[PDB]
Design a protein around this ligand. Structure first.
Ligand SMILES: Nc1nc2c(c(=O)[nH]1)=NC(=O)N=2
Ligand SMILES: [Ca+2]
Length: 314
DNA sequence: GGTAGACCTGGACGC
DNA sequence: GCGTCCAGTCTACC
């Protein structure tokens, strides 16, 4: 009862609610869709993970978003802690207004958005986002998720233990820059990305001015931010866009991957026009990104998550 | 400036 | 069962 992962039903007195209609958020579509790789549905309809250096389990009813925190006597999430949840899911942004707009300007979006509502963008931590996506290239969500777990367990602070699951905070820059980190990461199966992780942690801390340099990009322009990130090892056009969209408040950033190319070709009959290549290339990928922005507007990155997410269901 | 491989890993085909 | 295919970044020519 007092042990293991909690459920709304099993530990009633231990959950606080946040008004949130499923029309504004569908956890089952946001948490396992490749935005963040640290949430697990440990029990049906309940998702557990680390949010703001604390462990949480979240579940939702038709109109409520139920939250519970494990921190020292077990209490309820305070309205302050709940605020941390509101910021993570950027609940101030009205998903219904964006959907309305996108659907208005894009008949196909309208058609798809009808079956996949509640897909919004999480506002992630720069460091976690950076290395998680460095791990994402030329890889599948299943592996990435495992890789990111082993990584946090090996270099991240130990938080708390539920059942046989020990949660860890995300590794720090200093830890990731440590000696023999790449070697360790390889035995952990990160493949060649093991080097990227080490090299980018080192480069940030020893050549760019550390954490402040990264956090500063949030106030910077999208074009500036994306440009800066490309500097780092293992960070190409897509990874950079993922970071700008999900961690740097650059809502118009559109990550162009294999998924978005398929969608573009199949659902909009798109073809590169200012480029000679007919397939993915640095030129055509940049163009496709412009195409979606021109299609959905300032929040192109968010609209993207809707179709991307719905494309995963296949 | 603009392209062909090379690079870890492992679930998913296909024969 | 074994050999592909598939889920981006980087680099060596052209
Ligand atoms: N275009 C995208 N590429 C992604 C992604 C996402 O939400 N959009 N998650 C991910 O791991 N790769
Ligand atoms: Ca590919």
């Amino acid at each position: 009862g007092s042990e293991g992962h909690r459920t709304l039903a099993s530990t009633p007195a231990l959950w606080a609610s946040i008004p949130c209609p499923r029309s504004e958020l569908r956890l089952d579509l946001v948490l396992p869709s490749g935005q963040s790789f640290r949430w697990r549905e440990q029990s049906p309809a309940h998702w557990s993970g680390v949010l703001a250096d604390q462990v949480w389990t979240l579940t939702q009813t038709e109109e409520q978003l139920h939250c519970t925190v494990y921190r020292s006597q077990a209490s309820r999430p305070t309205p302050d802690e709940l605020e941390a949840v509101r910021k993570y899911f950027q609940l101030d942004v009205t998903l219904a207004q964006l959907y309305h707009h996108w659907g208005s300007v894009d008949s196909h979006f309208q058609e798809v958005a009808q079956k996949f509502q509640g897909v919004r963008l999480l506002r992630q931590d720069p460091i976690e986002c950076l290395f998680s996506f460095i791990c994402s290239s030329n890889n599948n969500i299943a592996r990435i998720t495992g890789m990111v777990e082993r990584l946090c367990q090996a270099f991240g602070p130990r938080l708390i233990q539920l059942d046989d699951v020990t949660y860890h905070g995300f590794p720090s820059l200093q830890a990731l820059a440590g000696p023999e980190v790449e070697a360790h990461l390889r035995k952990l199966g990160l493949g060649y990305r093991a080097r990227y992780v080490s090299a980018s942690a080192r480069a940030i801390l020893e050549e760019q001015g550390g954490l402040a340099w990264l956090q500063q990009l949030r106030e910077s322009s999208y074009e500036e931010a994306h440009k800066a990130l490309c500097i780092l090892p293992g960070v190409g056009t897509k990874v950079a866009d993922c970071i700008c969209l999900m961690a740097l408040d650059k809502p118009q950033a559109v990550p162009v991957d294999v998924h978005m190319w398929h969608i573009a070709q199949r659902d909009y009959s798109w073809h590169p026009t200012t480029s000679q290549a007919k397939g993915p290339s640095p030129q055509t990928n940049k163009e496709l990104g412009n195409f979606f922005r021109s299609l959905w507007g300032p929040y192109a990155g968010w609209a993207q998550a809707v179709l991307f997410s719905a494309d995963l269901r296949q």
